[PDB]
Design a protein around this ligand. Structure first.
Ligand SMILES: [Zn+2]
Ligand SMILES: [Zn+2]
Ligand SMILES: [Zn+2]
Ligand SMILES: [Zn+2]
Ligand SMILES: [Zn+2]
Ligand SMILES: [Zn+2]
Ligand SMILES: [Zn+2]
Ligand SMILES: [Zn+2]
Ligand SMILES: [Zn+2]
Ligand SMILES: [Zn+2]
Ligand SMILES: [Zn+2]
Ligand SMILES: [Zn+2]
Lengths: 525, 525, 525
């Protein structure tokens, strides 16, 4: 694990753990799937929302619930928790701006197979041009008894591309690039001159390309004992993401170049720090409930059945509060609670410095960012700032602040509306980044470790610091296993990229990484 | 109390009581503070929302609850009230369009100290130029044991100013005045050539001017036994308002010239008439609950934790309805209830008559205004109109009506969305005014007394008139003490402005006003 | 007298004396009236211009003359003055941009009483919107024998207002505010629904509102033994000014927020320093004549009977020079004389820094400003600069310099044209300020004391320094009484604002201020 400068071997390892997470999670369906595997690895229990939780949840244990396989709420109940005590909630969203396949996605023009796509969210759509695009999502498959189950599919190869016109044919594109959002924004799946295994149709106008359905059925059948024919695929959501893996960038690997950084970065930080806040025994002394909801559909305004503005968070909080017998315990618990809407913040862009307020704009790798807006697009008030300044004092991490320019529009996060349906005191924070809603996005790499330390300190110290805020009273190489800079020979895996176990861990056989057999060459100094 | 013509000595006294209220309330924090002192003066009890109200509230008494010290809900429960009976609710908002200090508010340019401000709401921003601006808000102060408490601070002096460019330097400003919302809209706090007590920094880039923090700590310490050093100030919301006191204007004092008239006047009218509807004994015969919620954040759309679209009003109404044992009593009580969204209406502007519909536009001092809009930006239907025409018939006050022009946009009030979360029948009314969302605002002075009489009649006669609407069935000088025109010698306070007690009250020693020793000269006729 | 920092207790007292002057002088008629009361308090004698001054003026005494009760020229003749000696002249102007009532000022629209106003000067007219406006001016009153005399009237209350349209009805006003100079710029005096004492006219189309004439007659009759009926009012000039009192602003009270700062600032400084240059005995050794002309109509170009371009200054100077018998003594005296056109200068605006020349732009509270322009809109040459640099060296006050940008227009002051009709060497100076010709204007507070010290030094040392320039040869609390920082207990007047007499002056009974009985509470340290 190469450490170029001021690198501390834990911020890199936390950032490298993010890279494995976001490369395996291109859809909210995959994001929820990867979070829930991490939750059950750390001892969480799945709760069916169809069931009744009166006898299923008890203090001292950790649970998670899932809606539409695309929104997930994980909560850990402290042992000293009574019904009526507050909640420490850190809310993220799993979705990102992208392109979905249309229901009739079959398109063909001039020998080229195209797919008909439709925009999702406010993406920066010129950044999607000339990119290797992968295809991912969930697929409904019929089985022989009539039941239909959901299969998540990842096609990890360059499969689609939206190509630009050449500059010879329109030299005005360098002056200002504009494009029609149908006719010039259609990605290419392949060529139809070479699929002539059968030159018939046998029914007019299939919904999708049969070669696309064959690949979806083949990619599903790789993970099953049986095989799936393409005729049993009923309907799907398919997401186009950037096909290229997220990996560290910069002169000192201080940047993270990644698709879907809009909250895949904070979801990772919120979910990791929920599990990190259970390490020694933070439960058996916790009097609150630590909730991490990772929502869906936040780029279009959360107005859905599983979005943040849905009843998903309030019904889960009421079902936790219905362990007590008094019916007023939900509204009592909300005023003792606190929400952290973890959504990413705008870092300082050096090339566009005029589109920033010059004194309240944060920087990369300088800590997480308290997003403050007077119009309450970000719903941070002073009562939240004092709490999270005390948390940052306890965690010993820096925090920054952000406002927009007054001649600039601001978009609401889920924080204002989650505050409305709960009545819960709240703050909007997030880690700084540049090129938000782009196809490929950039943030700092120290910022992942700073967020996890801050959030785990927020989870562990919420109950003590909540009663101290008085409103409303009466009147150059390290080891991936042990995160330490080594002082001796290094064993370099020639099969991975930057693995580099140490002297002790080489004999300790702790070199588990995605290489089935690694070759460790031993290297001086 | 000078009465120029058709003045009735009670409309002026109600308007003069408003002037004391709005001059002491430049922030929603101060507005809630002044309302709650008026509530506890009239016998209301504070309710902590952290507590359980099953044993704390009983019929025949009056209570108020507060969220974030910036939204307040006061309710009086009638003695004959059962859980399941309706609510008579008059909802206002405490906030106004203004400028907030940024988190990094320190700015300096060319020897001048500036503060970095950020816009709140849709204010008319050219009216803020060349005004004496005061600074007010709430300040979080640390104490020695770590707890942080909220202190409201008022700086009642000309402290800030946004100056225009001189006309010699840009003569085009008279043709059309436009300005950049950062670079030309920065107020001035002072000059830095004369703060040179220490010419160091001792740490790079403090968030605010140290001279500003010294004034905030000094203004706080005036009202405390101890002193506050500026280092213990953690964070604040600071509101810039117009520094100039509200006072009556016009040839006959028929106008009210005031900042923050956007519902400050209705919040005064709704809160006064809630207390005025308890005078003889309106409780001991009341079967409903009279609620006055004064919300926050309504100029940006109420999407907050304490706004109108929050759960603040529905959770309070459910906690009142949870005195009964049946869980369906909340939804039963809503269809027997009625909401009055008291938000100010557009009066007729004589200079801009083309931007008004010539037959449905109200006038100043002609009564409160029923705001009707087909697109339900104002949510008045006919069922509400018949109720409040009957109320105005009982109160003997005039009412008017307002619609917008069809080629004009209309902004939603809190009334439509408070109707949505409650299911409650509702009407949007308010008193007429001109220059809404300006820095200084104008309304009529008789209109304050007309609103209080109408609302107290609405509170006292709701239960009788609610069952009469059938929808959804089966198939020249007066005295400030006694508000009477005197007919004899007048005792004029030479120390106040227009105090003027009478013959009887001079011997009755009832001359309490903000002058520690007044000199009453006796005046013929 | 609160001293926040670097405050010297005399600059504040000079600025507080200005605040009393400008609050009592909203018209040039009131300005001349307040100057002349200050002149006769300091021993000046009134001269009728109808009389002959051959036997009325003698050396060693001070005189003043008045034209149209709106231009005033005060001059002090030294004891050692011979006819033919020079003049030390400091010329200001008494007028400011404002709105005058039309001759047919009665307007009514949609129940509102309006007054028809007409613009005076190049005022920044958007700053007049949403302001409390007072009414002042001179009124011609008939008496029973047919003679008509002039009465100055001040109506010190919010009486008029020009209201803006609300932002809901025209959202484009925030992009660029423009307004028609008749139809949308009509102030409001009151409502006509409540003046129905008589519902007749008795003659078609009276010139003004009868309720306005009743107030003018009532305000006049307050200062007279008899009463005035409104029928005897013949005609008037009535000036709309900002109704709000001038008072110190800023974090350290280093600003002066005031209406009419265009030369009521310099007239105050020129008139005070004329009287301050007589204190010990500056006469009995003075060989020149110290003239302070305060003109009228300078905002429209001084082309009037009492303006600067009139014969008012040259005829007064000739009548002084006609004490000698030689007829050539006037032209001899002009080349030994010097003019100081005291008109206010543009300070540095931090928000509009591009509309300024970055090296020749002065700052607030850094001394008075030598206005230099090549096109002689300001008529300063080098011969004047050397004289007033020597004066500033003697007075020990700083001076600055101003030029306009070359891509910016410049407006002429009275200095170029007063130079033309006299042939007199001259300089244009003034104190720096921002937002010139606004409704409310901002300047520094130390700048008033710096101007008075400079001008009194210019008056006292003119004769010595005029012969040294060789052109054209052969080939925290202080006391208001004693201006000293006190070191002991302070007696705080609870009835005034910031009066605060000291230990010695409390026993000395020297506490004369506008409070008929003050209560002095004694305060530690
Ligand atoms: Zn996002
Ligand atoms: Zn987003
Ligand atoms: Zn490997
Ligand atoms: Zn190791
Ligand atoms: Zn409003
Ligand atoms: Zn509003
Ligand atoms: Zn008084
Ligand atoms: Zn009385
Ligand atoms: Zn001028
Ligand atoms: Zn001027
Ligand atoms: Zn006093
Ligand atoms: Zn004294």
């Amino acid at each position: 694990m190469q450490l170029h400068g001021k690198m501390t071997a834990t911020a890199k390892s936390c950032a490298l753990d993010f890279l494995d997470f976001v490369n395996a999670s291109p859809t909210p369906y995959h994001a929820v799937q990867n979070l829930a595997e991490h939750y059950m690895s750390h001892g969480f229990q799945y709760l069916s929302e169809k069931s009744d939780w009166q006898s299923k949840i008890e203090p001292g244990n950790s649970y998670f619930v899932t809606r539409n396989k695309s929104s997930i709420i994980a909560f850990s109940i402290g042992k000293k928790w009574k019904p009526g005590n507050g909640f420490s909630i850190i809310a993220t969203h799993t979705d990102s701006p992208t392109l979905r396949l249309k229901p009739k996605s079959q398109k063909s023009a001039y020998g080229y197979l195209q797919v008909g796509v439709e925009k999702y969210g406010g993406g920066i759509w010129h950044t999607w041009f000339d990119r290797d695009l992968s295809l991912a999502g969930r697929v409904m498959v019929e089985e022989e008894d009539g039941r239909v189950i959901q299969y998540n599919v990842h096609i990890d190869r360059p499969l689609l591309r939206i190509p630009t016109l050449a500059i010879h044919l329109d030299p005005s594109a360098n002056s200002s690039f504009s494009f029609n959002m149908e006719t010039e924004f259609v990605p290419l799946i392949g060529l139809e001159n070479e699929l002539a295994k059968e030159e018939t149709s046998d029914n007019g106008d299939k919904y999708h390309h049969p070669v696309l359905l064959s690949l979806l059925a083949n990619e599903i059948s790789k993970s099953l004992e049986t095989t799936i024919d393409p005729s049993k695929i009923v309907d799907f959501e398919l997401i186009l993401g950037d096909a290229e893996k997220a990996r560290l960038g910069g002169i000192h690997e201080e940047f993270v170049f990644s698709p879907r950084l809009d909250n895949l970065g904070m979801t990772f930080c919120a979910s990791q720090a929920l599990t990190k806040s259970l390490e020694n025994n933070s439960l058996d002394n916790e009097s609150c409930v630590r909730v991490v909801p990772s929502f869906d559909h936040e780029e279009i305004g959360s107005v859905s059945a599983q979005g943040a503005e849905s009843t998903f968070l309030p019904a889960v909080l009421q079902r936790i509060c219905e362990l007590g017998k008094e019916s007023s315990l939900f509204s009592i618990s909300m005023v003792k609670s606190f929400l952290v809407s973890a959504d990413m913040a705008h870092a300082m862009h050096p090339n566009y410095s005029s589109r920033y307020e010059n004194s309240n704009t944060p920087f990369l790798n300088k800590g997480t960012v308290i997003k403050v807006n007077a119009n309450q697009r970000y719903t941070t008030n002073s009562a939240g700032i004092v709490l999270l300044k005390k948390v940052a004092q306890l965690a010993d991490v820096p925090i920054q602040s952000f406002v927009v320019r007054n001649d600039s529009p601001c978009g609401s996060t889920i924080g204002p509306k989650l505050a409305a349906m709960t009545g819960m005191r709240t703050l909007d924070l997030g880690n700084p980044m540049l090129s938000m809603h782009s196809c490929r996005e950039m943030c700092g790499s120290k910022d992942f470790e700073y967020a996890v330390v801050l959030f785990s300190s927020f989870f562990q110290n919420f109950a003590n610091l909540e009663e101290k805020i008085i409103i409303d009273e009466g009147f150059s190489v390290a080891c991936n296993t042990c995160l330490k800079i080594i002082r001796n020979d290094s064993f370099h895996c020639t099969k991975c990229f930057d693995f580099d176990v140490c002297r002790d861990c080489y004999a300790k056989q702790a070199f588990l990484h995605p290489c089935p057999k690694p070759h460790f060459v031993l290297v001086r100094s």
